[model samples]
Target: KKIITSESVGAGHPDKICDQISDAILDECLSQDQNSRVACEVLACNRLIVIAGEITTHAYVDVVKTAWEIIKPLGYDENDFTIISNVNKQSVNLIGAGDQGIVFGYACDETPQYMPLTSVLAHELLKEIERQRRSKEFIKIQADMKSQVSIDYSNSTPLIETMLVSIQHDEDYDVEYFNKKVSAIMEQIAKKYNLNTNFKKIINSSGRFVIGGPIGDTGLTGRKIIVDTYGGVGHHGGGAFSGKDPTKVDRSASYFARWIAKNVVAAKLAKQCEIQLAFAIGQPQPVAMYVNTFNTNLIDETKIFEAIKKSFNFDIKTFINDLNLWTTKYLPVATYGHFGRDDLDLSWEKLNKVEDLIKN
Candidate 1:
């Protein structure tokens, strides 16, 4: 058996809060100006926050109010963060590749969503945490939390090996009672996944989580890069997704690459796929493109690549408009893993190109 691990953070976690805020601002930018240039970064610590980045948009957004609105749902005080923002118009003189970097996209048959197994389960665990926390049964649990799930695989089949969860709760709660309640939730999750009855569990291993979230630690934008993507199951191109518009290949190209990879897997061309795209400063076209099937292809990888080129336009602008990313699409997946989210309507998640890819 082989073990693979993936982790996800709750919306209330400090880093997630920052990411949510940044993406919220970006959405506001897109809603107003389709040609907006925004690259926002947030630093959150204790009760202090500093949002500083490059935003050159004709659209005027109330940054302070936007920050306040995003806080409550994530289980934070709007005023808890003394919000500070420094934004400026994009420099017209700059040649705008914007930034030089590569972005990656991955997909597999491990889960129905085509996401890796451990990542899918970890996200579900925290989603369960948030749901239970809001209800009467799991009362006294706070919002700041993180979860990890590990899977053991004997070839293609997966077995749940261990689950770890850490959450901020009322300090005075009884430890024994806490363990019982949390274990009960864990059992329910295990049953849902058809895991073993003797599955191992770890809850709040660091002892007390009384002081967590922004009150406990500082959060910065682009911090939860791994959590935002495939959760260690696949490769990342060292660029963060949130707080950037589709014009930035770091964000849009990644989504485009995922669209291609998912279509490859969905079309039964491969059991797993990874797409890589690189861009240079001021370049409208990608510098390089790659597709790797990890030897899970039913047909030649070259044919699939050719199909991708014909199926979709590699030009950044064409994909940006094609995907229609210039909208308020960021806030929904801010906490949970971005891909494989059934709740959100994402362009890249669409299976419209499946038949086309398979035809070639």
Candidate 2:
């Protein structure tokens, strides 16, 4: 059987907490100034949080206060932490690529949202886990968690193969009870997806998960890039999105590419699609552009490429306006992967260009 796997981390996971804090700061900056230039990075460890990066904005956001605000609600105590800021302003511009690098956008028809099934399932599992952690009577359950799902695609339809969940909790929590409750939750999720729930279960195989989050593992912003996009199912440009202003092609162009790729798949031009965009510093146009359908195109590759080019406008300014990235909230995107998101009304996920793509 052909097995593929994807994993996701909860919002309270150490790295994800850093991602959330970074984007929270970014949001505060953008809320005050839409044109703010920010490339914030955060680091978290036991009892300490550090915010460091280049930020150029007219906004007066309290970095220390923002860090505490993000951490306190995630089951961590602000009174027990020390916060530090080493941020500075960067010389910047608008309508130009913030730096030179590549960005990838991908889509596949394996799921209703046109994403890899493993990626979607893993994300959904973690989302539900987080929900139960917050609202359920499992008082000892803490915030930090991780989930992985594996699926077999060798058959006519996909079959769930295995699921792994690692959750943090108090030392006195019952491991067996936790596993049973989480297993039932997974069954409900699997039923929602109309998939098999009899998959192998691996719950905290390393036994007790008493120490977790930043206390057990240090976290840095942009470290969960794989979990932030495509869940390791597709190519990444090695550019992390959190805390960066939308003008940075690493964030904006990536969103633009997803918009294009999603529209192409929605247009029924391909069953799978991936778009690559590369830019140069201070340049408004992408230096290189390539589209691949992975032999799943309904038409000739050249024709599809032409249609894609004719149907979309990828100029930095045009796409920034089209995707509305500047005013978008990035905190929610800090946990689950950015693409294939059904929970958010992301502009890049729109299929508005499908008709144009089909005709062009």
Candidate 3:
């Protein structure tokens, strides 16, 4: 009888663009120096871009060019943009949690990807939109877009309640025709999830989306934390994932937590699981680790908790190496929710530890 909603933004969404730029720089940094410690932040507003943060690396990446490259393909002209870099090397160490913070990771069996249905569907909607847009099937549609999906659970099973999409378009595009086409795309995505295609649909409720991206709004790194993680179905640590290297527990430990939660669920130890990790700055190990299955455990809860502790190493450097974060590309993860991604080859998403959890 209640509805839960989750939202997703496209690659060119203002905030997402900032995330992309930050990760792009990080990718280049790590590519040249595997031990690079990069914490890059970005801001986008209209034709101006600001790059700020502390990065420690030997890699000589052209920050201005790297940033502009991220914007150029997103329907913007390089000549119209002014990019600035205020980044500097950090006076820091390489060990311990990069900073003191808490991180949360969650998983559920509601969807095939072990993610919440609303989140998965919302992501799929925009993902499909981007697919068609880049292929020229939806030429009028621009990269800046967002989608929200609401799920009705009154029947003890979920059904699509309402779907909303806001897509940037050409100044003189047909509103009615665009609405119909977007609705059709929504219906197709709904059917794929076995959801109700007859659900209410709303596209660009304000009637026009002629101007979007950084032009219509300002963006900052880590602003889309909810969209970056589990979409509101679970909790977040208030730490943004973008711009920080794996040394930052907020980003890497969070992924480690997801790996643990996913393995717990995949091992059938729980139908739903949330892993909480707490760290202290300059401390090489997590100060505290807790596992909550939300009363969906199939085995002794203590056993599940104990299994996690025994199954994985909690040391910061060990996990960073175990998860292959040093060389993983951050660009692909900039868009869409970070967890439960089947499209990307993320180390944290692997089920390799499922048997270990089951054995314990």
Candidate 4:
């Protein structure tokens, strides 16, 4: 069996949670002030959530209230977590997006999961574990969680054979207690997916995980960019999605490109597709939009490109509004992998243009 590995982090971690909080704050700002300039970062520890960043908006937003809105939903309380602000040092200029960068979006027919199967399955397992913990099905489990799925692939199809997961709990919780609880959850996930195989389930390889979350380490926004995207399957342009406004093509265009690629595959234009877009700060449009099919196209590459050009509009303003992207909250994306999500009402994930492409 050929081996491919993928991993995902839970929302409780400081960095991941910060991404969610930042996006949530963005959503709130957009709801009230579409022109709001927000670049926020969050850090949480034993009982504190530190929110620090730059903001230029005409609206009045209570940062603490927004932070609590995200934390309370994640099973944390103000008593359990205090929100603080980072101290600003020198004079800073409130400018537009920081820099120009390339963000790649990709899709392939590697698994029924619609993602490279290993990474998709890793996210699924981690999400289920969080669900079980939140539902009180596993009382001893804490918020922090991580999981990995290694797939055996032949001819580009994935076969799951090995799975690893680690759960962090309160210091009072024992290893044996978490092991049993996690095993039960993993078994349920495997059975739910009707997975067949004698898979290895490793829980908490460290023997003791009493030290976890921000208390154990400091986290910053955009640190988990790889995990947020294709799990090392594609290239990263070194720009983070969280804490920035949509004007930053680094965040908005990357999402738009993924939406376009997924729609192309969903339309049967190709078995796999990868897209790249680059932009300069203060520019209203991208410098270039490029597409690749990895030689899996049913039609000529030129024809595919023509179809995309004919079927979709790539304007930045239209892209943002067409997807209702600025309207919905994006905090949840900071946690689990951002792409290939069918549950969330993410604009970029929609395949509404599939029929349009087929018609043309």
lDDT leader: 3
Q: lDDT for every model?
A: 0.83, 0.86, 0.89, 0.76
Candidate 3 RMSD computed on C-alpha atoms after optimal superposition onto the true structure: 1.5
- The list of candidate 2 runs beyond 4 A from truth reads 89-94
Cα lDDT tens digits for candidate 3, 222-279: 8999989988988888999888788888999999999998888989999999988898
* Residue 225, candidate 4: C-alpha displacement in angstroms: 0.6
Those runs of model 3 whose alpha carbons end farther than 4 Å from true positions after fitting are 89-94
Off by over 4 Å in 1: 89-96
Per-residue lDDT tens digits of candidate 1, residues 196-244? Answer: 7566899999988898878857899888989999998778998887788
The C-alpha TM-scores of every prediction are: 0.94, 0.96, 0.97, 0.89
RMSD, model 1, all Cα superposed? 2.3
Which numbered prediction scores highest in TM-score against the true structure?
3
lDDT of 4 at 148: 84
Error of 4 at 280 (Å): 1.9
lDDT-sorted candidate list, best first:
3, 2, 1, 4
lDDT of candidate 4 over 148-237, digit per residue (tens): 877666644345677898777776876676777777766776666666456787878877765666664676778889889998877778
Count of backbone clashes for each model?
A: 2, 0, 1, 4
Show the colliding residue pairs in model 4.
Answer: 47-81, 47-82, 48-82, 49-82
